[PDB]
Amino acid sequence: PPPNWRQPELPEVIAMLGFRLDAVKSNAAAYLQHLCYRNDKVKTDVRKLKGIPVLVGLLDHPKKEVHLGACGALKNISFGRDQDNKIAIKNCDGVPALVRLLRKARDMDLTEVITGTLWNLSSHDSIKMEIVDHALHALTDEVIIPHSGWEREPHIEWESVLTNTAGCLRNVSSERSEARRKLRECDGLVDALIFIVQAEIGQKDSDSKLVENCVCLLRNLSYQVHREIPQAERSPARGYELLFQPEVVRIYISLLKESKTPAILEASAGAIQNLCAGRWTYGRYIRSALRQEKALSAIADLLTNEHERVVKAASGALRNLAVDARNKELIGKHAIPNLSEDTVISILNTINEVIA
């Protein structure tokens, strides 16, 4: 009985993920991906048909056509409105499987698919702590460090893989306390992140998604740093101490002057606000350095931004600078002229704290 172009029903395709022949498995996975692409119904179906644990399982298959295949299917299944598809991948240990494959990925294409999938999964709160717990060290050591071009002991590459990965990490650090603690205390991670951003800015790129993701990530990690950093009792600064060194601060300020991307503008302001928030030595120093002419205007200037979220970031920043301002003049000068409902309260709480 000679071969043909029969198209199988979804249940069959799923059944074939388990067939003896590897070529059947891989082509099934491939096809599965195609069927899901831009198709929410099919994706949700694959879940209800119990295909997800089967795909997750193939991530362990020795042959690349099969694992790459499964992984590309999972990628599509992990994207879209049906947040239960993401949960499903998590619930059958997708993340440790993905990580396990990552450790042995050798090529960009597979790495591309894995990290993108992780990025997709990371958009979902129920999965963030999972990724933090199982993917942090591999994402850091296998992806960020090697490809960043950074070196503890002094070129950037694989921009796409990096973006996916910085996006994933941005995502899992958006809210959780010990997600921030884990990430920022992860040797090399902050170092490399900053290195990435310099690299981009040295290419006159202050808008790339890769820059955006790294900065939102840095923003999160800066949140409450004066407090959550080991021995918050306050030679070359390493790791999370880089979050509050002049080096990065100047990067934020240059992005405010150079970046035309709301996300980046907002996160750079947010970073500054975070660093300034603390009543601690480095807060005193950063805050003082920031109350200088060129910086104050760069910040204040985005109070005239079209985008609400960036307007709000600047306000928070400015209000933080005013707390121990020792030249009400400079700050008052640059803020006031320019200074939703929550936005209003912020701009108001800020005017107040400026004039004490």
Binding site: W5, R6, P8, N27, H34, R38, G116, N120, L121, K209
Partner: peptide, 18 residues
């Protein structure tokens, strides 16, 4: 948050399904 991974179409050999 943002599902930056997105999705892609994919190629396959239908004639091997079976």
């Amino acid at each position: 948050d943002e599902e930056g991974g997105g999705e892609e179409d994919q190629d396959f050999d239908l004639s091997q399904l079976h």
